[PDB]
Design an enzyme around this catalytic site. Sequence first.
Site, PDB file in Angstrom:
ATOM      1  CG  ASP A  35      -1.795   1.182   1.304  1.00 40.57           C
ATOM      2  OD1 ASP A  35      -1.905   1.902   0.300  1.00 40.57           O
ATOM      3  OD2 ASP A  35      -2.407   1.390   2.375  1.00 40.57           O
ATOM      4  CB  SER A 199      -2.147  14.381 -13.366  1.00 35.85           C
ATOM      5  OG  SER A 199      -2.560  14.135 -14.692  1.00 35.85           O
TER       6      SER A 199
END
Length: 330
Positions: A35, A199
Amino acid sequence: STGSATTTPIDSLDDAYITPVQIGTPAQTLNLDFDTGSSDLWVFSSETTASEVDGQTIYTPSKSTTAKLLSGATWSISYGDGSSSSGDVYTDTVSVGGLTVTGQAVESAKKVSSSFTEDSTIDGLLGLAFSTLNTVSPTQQKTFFDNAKASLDSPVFTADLGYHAPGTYNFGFIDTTAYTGSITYTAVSTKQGFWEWTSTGYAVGSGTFKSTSIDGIADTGTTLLYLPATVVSAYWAQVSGAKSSSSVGGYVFPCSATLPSFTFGVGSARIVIPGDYIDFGPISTGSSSCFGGIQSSAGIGINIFGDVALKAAFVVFNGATTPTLGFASK
């Protein structure tokens, strides 16, 4: 040193991936959920409340000649999905794919929430976010990667998650045969303890690319892609009959639909998520309403590039002094 381990989807939807991890001496192999959005290595154990164990493999520290109680240390974690677990702490030898760390904090669960009990395939979590998020008190502990870093050939790990197939976690090297083209690296902020990046935009299907900054985290422990409501609405508007269902808890779409791809930007590069990766199947057995793999982050507080996004790429988690993320197509 290096390590390399195969990671395998737990079910036919790729809801999560499990990776075998050797703990203790002799080894006890548990299948952990790696994770990158958390920083605790915790396991089902001989200390876990018996009614909360249902098919998981447990770590038994008393059977490990290298286990040592970390005296006074406790841990307690709550995840973004509302699940939680807590317990005490041992140090022991932990190996992943041939890479061994001695003295790793292994957090033994005394209690786990129902979603963990109900998932017999996941024996615990191995956190790969920054150690500043580790919950052990009163002495915070380091992640497996942080402990291994100095010994690794290069201070990196890579995630190569499969679509409906196994993939690979590598430590200490970048497998140049595992991706196509070049890897585009992008800056990381560690201010929240995550692999947080920005992004450069998105496209829906064959549509034009929208240049817009989208801050979010690279999180292998989250199944879906959670993005701003504007972006998510633009995606689902291209699927006839798709709608957000308050009762179901997100966007659903007719199972008869063909889904468009979704592209996200990494610098000037582009990662394309095929439409089929966005199909999470019937909301309940036999239903013709299917659950979408792109959902709004509006109620989370952060955008999350979970498995739906990451499995479309070869992803480099560069833990150099100034960390960065790399993405390549594959």
